[model samples]
Target: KDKDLLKGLDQEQANEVIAVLQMHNIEANKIDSGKLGYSITVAEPDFTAAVYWIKTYQ
Candidate 1:
């Protein structure tokens, strides 16, 4: 199950977060929602930790 980690981000912001998540061995995918902006999602197993990393690194 893919779970959302972040949203409303531009391409640059989205990639930055992707790189960050990758560093933690957490593979994340980006969804280009167009009007709403980019979104990031990781597998369910990584969801909690993904949120922690994003918040800690942001």
Candidate 2:
């Protein structure tokens, strides 16, 4: 299953987060959340790692 890690991020920020997460071997992606902003997500296995990176880099 997929996990939602971060939300309300602009396109560039979401892309940047995904790029960095991917570089660190974490699977991630984004979706439009009701046109409010982009939502970032990761796989269940990568949940911990993804949160760490997003918090670290934010």
Candidate 3:
């Protein structure tokens, strides 16, 4: 399952996002296309958790 979890400025940033995301066992992905450069998306979006992780990790 895919959900739009997190989108980073670039692939490296997105990778960092996924690292934290994976800690919570959240299915995630990264995309580096023009439409979405260095992006991170979740299988099922836990937006609140996403927000927390971003704030905490970043």
TM-scores, each model vs. reference:
0.71, 0.68, 0.57
Per-candidate clash tally:
0, 0, 2
Over the stretch 7-50, how does candidate 2's per-residue lDDT look in tens digits?
Answer: 67787777888787888876676756554467677787767877
**What lDDT score belongs to each candidate, Candidate 1 first?**
0.73, 0.71, 0.63
- Give the poorly placed runs of model 2, Cα more than 4 Å off: none
Candidate 1 lDDT, tens digit per residue, 1-58? 5554555878787787888878887767776654556877787777777788778666
> Candidate 3's residue-wise lDDT over 1-55, tens digit each?
3344444376666667878878888755664555445666654446566667779
Best by lDDT: 1
The 10-residue segment of model 1 with minimum total lDDT is: 1-10
Looking at model 3, the pairs that clash are 3-42, 5-42
Greater-TM-score candidate between 1 and 2: 1
Please estimate how well model 3 matches the true structure, expressed as its whole-model Cα lDDT: 0.63
Q: Would you give me the overall lDDT of model 2?
A: 0.71
Candidate number that wins on TM-score, 2 or 3: 2
